[PDB]
Amino acid sequence: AENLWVTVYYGVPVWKDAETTLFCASDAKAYETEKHNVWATHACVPTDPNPQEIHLENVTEEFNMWKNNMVEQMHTDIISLWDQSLKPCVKLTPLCVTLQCTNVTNNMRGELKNCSFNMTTELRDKKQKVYSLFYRLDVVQINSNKEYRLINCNTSACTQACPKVSFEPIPIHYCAPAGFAILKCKDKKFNGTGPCPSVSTVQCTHGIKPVVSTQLLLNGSLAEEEVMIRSENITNNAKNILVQFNTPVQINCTRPNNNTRKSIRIGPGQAFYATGDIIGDIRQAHCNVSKATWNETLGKVVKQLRKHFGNNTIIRFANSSGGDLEVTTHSFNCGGEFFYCNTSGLFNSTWISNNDSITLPCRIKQIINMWQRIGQCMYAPPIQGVIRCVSNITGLILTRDGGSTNSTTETFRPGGGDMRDNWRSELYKYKVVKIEPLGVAPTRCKRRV
């Protein structure tokens, strides 16, 4: 008979989009530094050093980085890995006690208070007078001399972060479970939403590094073609714009105090790391970036924004207006110490369609509270001596405003939100798919009985 018969095939190259739990792998030399000098690697299994792309010839399919599942898995993983890095450490509860205080002496600043209090020895029946330095942001006036408590002490206890565990971000790879594949959009002009015309599969991602920062993002990866700007819609103001640079711009940051740690026994085998003393002069923590290459870099992002906003629209920048400290400032951890800096030195310019450093000041906190989780205070211990960091600023987050009076619709401000879109910066080009290996198709062959 000439008519066709159905024939079944197994292992046909076909897939469909799916939610699936990725598993994380970390590079073996960090893993070989066993028992957690850092978190993640102690659970994040050793990588195969052969990532092995294959170009999926003639393929072309729709990526969407906004609705992507693996950013939400990254966000949820990082929170869980963070908590368990704190869970073995000492609960600092006995420090929530009445403090006598005065300003520091050996200096402009009023930011340091010197405070004295009573604390238990290891022996239950014995307690001592003791003293330490705190920032004006760590303490609240509970009230002759002024009298204080810690800021958190009405709302939660805090955990001291263990000194042996470093906050430095290691590379992390995300790997597909069996019968799923990651896809990678290879196209250097991809904007995060559309049919990517050239793709590879890969078993496991880049070494993504879990930095955390607010107004601008740093040590992450950067596109080779041009400055990329992308958003879930642009025109709707409530959406962020993610900007990724064509080249880094290089920031130096410093804490110029010669800082001294002191140890206090809270109890039988429990100790708290007091700020003991500052030797030499007390001086402000601050960051530098080159005025020339920064001004040039904004000169490039403006030329991109003109593609979306007319021609001679008067594109201009302003500082992060209003709210609390965590929205108003750029924020990060350097070397095991947390920073908050007011970026209005950078975002203060206006543009029309025609050698030395900026220095921006910073402030420090010892207690911190990550992802605004109300009960999860933690206390970061003082770290010894003068410290500094060097970073590549990779890209930045902008937010827009409506027509500012007339002509311009483009007062841009350094944005923010949930930390989740720092992951969407690195995961901008990956997708995950489920293999469907069965197929049925007609041909002119028949079985016999």
């Binding site: 292992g11 299994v45 195969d48 479970p177 069996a178 019968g179 599969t201």
Partner: protein
């Protein structure tokens, strides 16, 4: 990199090639559908090794173990579903269900010689739950017809 016949020695590399030429590479997806678990069983590791206490980060390994049981079980279900059609030994079967050309009007050349498998999927995904029903019944009676023949002799 880009073209017909070239990348077939890698997982999925055939996916843009036309259905006829892709039909040679079927063993590669079939093998990698299960044995990719080497990237799990080589490196899943617990207490003392890399970790000490933080005990919820040993019990975090439930994510990796849960992925393994889903992988073996989703694979095993294909071997069941391919088995009841009277076809488990093979990567290819001819079968005695006739192609009802209502499911697609397209002739024998253009399906093998022009389309990719990802394109053919989007047609027959309308009708596939008919076709699986017919395949099951076509075998279910064939088993009985064979038992009668081996008996009446």
């Amino acid at each position: 990199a880009v073209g017909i016949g070239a990348v077939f020695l890698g997982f999925l590399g055939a996916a843009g090639s036309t259905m006829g030429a892709a039909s040679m590479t079927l063993t590669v997806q079939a093998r990698n559908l299960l044995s990719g678990i080497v990237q799990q069983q080589s490196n899943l590791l617990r207490a003392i090794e890399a970790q000490q206490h933080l005990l919820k980060l040993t019990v975090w390994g439930i994510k990796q173990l849960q992925a393994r049981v889903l992988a073996v079980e989703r694979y095993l279900r294909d071997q069941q579903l391919l088995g009841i059609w009277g076809c488990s030994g093979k990567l290819i079967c001819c079968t005695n269900v006739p192609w009802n050309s209502s499911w697609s009007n397209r002739n024998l050349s253009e399906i093998w010689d022009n389309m990719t498998w990802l394109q053919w999927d989007k047609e027959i995904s309308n009708y596939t739950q008919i076709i699986y029903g017919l395949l099951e019944e076509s075998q279910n009676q064939q088993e009985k017809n064979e038992q009668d023949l081996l008996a009446l002799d």
